[PDB]
């Protein structure tokens, strides 16, 4: 194996490769949303900015995992990035509800990875998950839930969506 | 008795200790409200910041009473701090109405303390009450009154509550 | 359940509510000590400043748990804050011994909470406990242990207590 | 009467002239103490500085009363300023105990003058006494009481007195 590899189970190596793909998909989904909200018939620049940054953040998460794979002596194997499940995301609220579901899907995958790492007695990998991923994921989920509540209070359609969009800008 | 005590009736000493507890309880109530408004299903950050600052202020009022007790040679007697009357505070308006009632309750207590101090010929204590508490208390009640009127004008539910929350943040 | 809740066991939510109350109690104890040391017949301003800071920090610890509860979609339940276990804390050494006892009690509670979190496979919570509480608690205990040893060397009564008080101011 | 005189009773005017003399007498006491502690066979420069400052503040208190007399249209009547009955003040502790007694004597006089002003329905004069004198008097008494306690802790003779003196420099 690698001259560096130590206490790194092939199962964790495989799950990290799966997670790289999932973070890249999430980046792609938020990229889709970002430009959906820049359509002339949608025109929600705060939502667009929010999801642009989210797409950037998820691709950075993916790259941290790739760096981690190399750090531990595993081999990055990239897989096809799936097309986003939708081409058009509906209302601001529906996009937020889709994002909340995706963040929780990612969170479940991260927790299943953490279970794999713990089961193989890899505390270097549990630390990575805990400090660089699971922490941000709970914060992102809380943030999106907050936004869902706020938009439902303001609107969620019409003038309330227009005003809520301004808080994201 | 204390080497510093002079013209300090035991009834005023005891009333100060009751007021310390009342200030600490008000701080607790506003701390409860502050974090209620940060629930993911409430998400009113302006209401949260307002009540956080109110909680800090009330704790400061308690400490000023404790400092005063020591200054006069009285002895601080601390008691349990009661649970807040509610765990869920409802709408922003209902929370403001609760706060208005609590401020007027505290105002009543302070005015009764002033009567005790006045009946015992303690001008140092009537000065404290007038300058450090009764003035602040009337200003707070007026503020909360204004806020209730503004929120009723804005909403008090839906978009108007969303927009009012912005002026507190 | 909350729209954000995920992998958050009801026993962990309940234990966090218990811990919030314990941190608020610890804040209350140090607040009592702080103003005990400002009595005209005690007059230890360094002790007073130390326990004033300790009280603020414990109140901050409680608020971080409250923020955490909301982040995970649990619901804050606030209870009565018991009166501090004394009204008069004796010598500087006796108050530090009492503070040591309390810090270790709080540590035991946090370690029990970590066991609850660990047993329910909640690494977000074990991370919070390790990084935001357990680390600080061990530093706190060591600091107080050092101070007890220093005061016993200096005094613990008379000129030694007077001189030691100056290193905390 | 004076073109400015309004709601100013002759008993209040008389008591203010009496109080002026008491403040000048207090200033003289503290001047006596100040230079006693600079004797080569006493050599307590911290005590000397403290009592020098105290002497200056009592003289300022007398001048504020003289200014007040003029403001109300009363006429200042100045009398002999008695020397202290005791000028061999003894130890630092003995001087602090004498200062505490003097401070409480002045306070009792101020409180009697408040009663006179209140009985003659003079709110301008009660305001003066509460804000310019009674407030500072309680703060002065608390400070000297604190010092007596610290000095007893430190010493009150020998090394502890030498060290306590440094705190006042
Ligand atoms: Fe991610
Ligand atoms: Fe208050
Ligand atoms: Fe704590
Ligand atoms: Fe004076």
Please provide the DSSP assignment of D97-144 as one string: HHHHHHHHHHHHHHHHHHHHHHHTT-HHHHHHIIIIIIHHHHHHHHHH
Residue B87 CA, distance from chain mean position = 18
Task: Using the Cα atoms of residue C22, residue C25, residue C31 and residue C32 in order, give the sign of their dihedral.
Answer: negative
3-state secondary structure of C81: strand
Judging contacts by C-beta atoms under 8 Å, the chain B residues touching residue A155 are: 159
The distance of D92 to chain C (nearest Cα, Å) reads 16
Cα–Cα dist D99/D18, whole Å: 20
Judging contacts by C-beta atoms under 8 Å, the chain A residues touching residue B162 are: 150, 153-154, 160, 163-164
> Domain C10-168, what architecture?
Up-down Bundle (1.20)
What angle do the packed helices C10-36 and C92-119 form, to 10 degrees? 170
D104 close to C (CB below 8 A): no
User: How many helices (DSSP H) and strands (DSSP E) are in chain D?
Assistant: 6, 0
The distance of B148 to chain C (nearest Cα, Å) reads 26
Q: Which of B6, B124, B126 is closest, CB to CB, to D104?
A: B6
* B61 in Cβ contact with B140 (< 8 Å): no
**β-pair partners for B81:** C81
Name the closest ligand to CA D136. Answer: 4
A119 close to B (CB below 8 A): no
Take residue D146 and report the two structure tokens written for it: 């604190």
Count the neighbouring beta carbons within 10 Å of the beta carbon of residue D136: 14
C9 close to A (CB below 8 A): no
Look-up of token digits 């810090």 = C103
A154 close to B (CB below 8 A): yes
Cα–Cα dist D50/D36, whole Å: 12
How many angstroms is it from D111 CA to the middle of ligand 4?
12
Nearest CA in chain B to C41: B2
Mark whether A and C touch (3+ CB pairs within 8 Å). yes
Judging contacts by C-beta atoms under 8 Å, the chain B residues touching residue D148 are: 3
* D96 in Cβ contact with D155 (< 8 Å): no
Q: Of A72, A58, A85, A68, which is closest to residue A9 (Cα–Cα)?
A: A72
Confirm whether residue D137 is marked as ligand binding: yes
Classify each residue of A38-77 as buried b or exposed e, where b means 16 or more C-beta atoms within 10 Å of its C-beta: beeebebebbbbbbbebbebbbebbeebbebbeebebeee
The distance of C144 to chain B (nearest Cα, Å) reads 24
Cα–Cα dist A126/A114, whole Å: 6
Cα–Cα dist C17/C20, whole Å: 5
Query: Which subunits have 3 or more CB–CB pairs within 8 Å of chain D?
Result: B, C
**β-pair partners for C81:** B81
Nearest CA in chain D to B131: D131
* C167 in Cβ contact with C161 (< 8 Å): no
Q: What is the DSSP letter of C121?
A: T
B contact test, residue of A103, A146, A155, A166 with most B CBs within 10 A = A146
A98 close to C (CB below 8 A): no
Mark whether C and D touch (3+ CB pairs within 8 Å). yes
Look-up of token digits 């705190």 = D167
Cα–Cα dist A13/A75, whole Å: 8
B43 close to A (CB below 8 A): yes
Angle at D50 between CA D154 and CA C161, to 5 degrees: 15
Q: Give the residue ranges of the annotated binding site of B for Zn(2+).
A: 131
How many angstroms is it from C37 CA to the middle of ligand 1?
51
Q: Is B81–C28 a contact, with Cβ atoms under 8 angstroms apart?
A: yes
* A58 in Cβ contact with A50 (< 8 Å): no
Mark whether A and D touch (3+ CB pairs within 8 Å). no
Look-up of token digits 């909470």 = C113
3-state secondary structure of D3: coil
Judging contacts by C-beta atoms under 8 Å, the chain B residues touching residue C8 are: none
Residue D27 CA, distance from chain mean position = 6
Residue A15 CA, distance from chain mean position = 16
* C164 in Cβ contact with C154 (< 8 Å): yes
> How many residues does this entry show for chain A?
169
Classify each residue of D88-126 as buried b or exposed e, where b means 16 or more C-beta atoms within 10 Å of its C-beta: ebebbbebbbbbbebbbebbebbbebbebbeeeebeebb
* C40 in Cβ contact with B4 (< 8 Å): yes
* A155 in Cβ contact with A169 (< 8 Å): no
C159 close to D (CB below 8 A): yes
The distance of B25 to chain D (nearest Cα, Å) reads 28
A125 close to B (CB below 8 A): no
Q: Is the peptide bond before C156 cis (omega within 30 degrees of 0)?
A: yes
Cα–Cα dist C18/C113, whole Å: 10
Take residue D37 and report the two structure tokens written for it: 């502690």
Q: Of C72, C84, C79, C101, which is closest to residue C29 (Cα–Cα)?
A: C84
Q: How far apart are the first and last CA of chain C?
A: 49
Q: How far apart are the first and last CA of chain D?
A: 49
Look-up of token digits 């009012």 = B164
Judging contacts by C-beta atoms under 8 Å, the chain B residues touching residue D125 are: none
Angle at C132 between CA C24 and CA B41, to 5 degrees: 70
Cα–Cα dist B169/B8, whole Å: 43
B157 close to C (CB below 8 A): no
* C38 in Cβ contact with C45 (< 8 Å): yes
The distance of D135 to chain B (nearest Cα, Å) reads 7
C118 close to A (CB below 8 A): no
Cα–Cα dist D96/D28, whole Å: 15
DSSP assignment of B110-169, as one string? HHHHHHHHHHTT-HHHHHHHIIIIIHHHHHHHHHHHHHHHHHHHH-SSTHHHHHHHHHH-
* C78 in Cβ contact with B83 (< 8 Å): yes
How many angstroms is it from B119 CA to the middle of ligand 4?
26
3-state secondary structure of D160: helix
Cα–Cα dist C143/C141, whole Å: 5
Judging contacts by C-beta atoms under 8 Å, the chain B residues touching residue A162 are: none
Resolution (A): 1.8
Q: What is the DSSP letter of D81?
A: -
Question: What distance separates the 2 farthest-apart alpha carbons in chain C?
Answer: 61
The distance of D14 to chain C (nearest Cα, Å) reads 35
* B5 in Cβ contact with D102 (< 8 Å): no
Q: Which of A142, A153, A159 is closest, CB to CB, to B40?
A: A142
Take residue D36 and report the two structure tokens written for it: 């006693």
Judging contacts by C-beta atoms under 8 Å, the chain D residues touching residue B3 are: 100, 145, 148
Name the closest ligand to CA B62. Answer: 2
Q: Is C162–D160 a contact, with Cβ atoms under 8 angstroms apart?
A: yes
Dihedral of the CA atoms C4, C7, C9, C14 (nearest 10)? -50
Residue-range domain boundaries for chain D:
10-168
Q: Exposed, middle or buried, C108 (CB in 10 Å: 0-12/13-18/19+)?
A: exposed
C169 close to D (CB below 8 A): no
Q: Is the peptide bond before D169 cis (omega within 30 degrees of 0)?
A: no
Judging contacts by C-beta atoms under 8 Å, the chain C residues touching residue D160 are: 158-159, 162
B81 close to C (CB below 8 A): yes
């Amino acid at each position: 194996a690698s001259q560096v590899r130590q206490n790194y189970h092939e199962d964790c190596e495989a799950s990290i490769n799966k997670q790289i793909n999932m973070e890249l998909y999430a980046s792609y989904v938020y990229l889709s949303m970002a430009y959906y909200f820049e359509r002339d018939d949608v025109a929600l620049p705060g939502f667009a900015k929010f999801f642009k940054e989210s797409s950037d953040e998820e691709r950075e998460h993916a790259q941290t995992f790739m760096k981690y794979q190399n750090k531990r002596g595993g081999r990055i194997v990239l897989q096809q990035i799936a097309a986003p499940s939708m081409q058009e995301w509906g209302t601001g609220l529906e996009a937020l509800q889709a994002a909340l579901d995706l963040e929780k899907q990612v969170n479940q995958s991260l927790l299943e990875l953490h279970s794999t790492a713990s089961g193989n007695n890899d505390p270097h990998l549990t630390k990575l998950l805990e400090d660089e991923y699971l922490e941000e994921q709970v914060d992102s989920i809380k943030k999106i839930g907050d936004m869902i509540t706020k938009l439902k209070r303001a609107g969620p359609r019409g003038l309330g969506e227009y005003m809520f969009d301004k808080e994201l800008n």
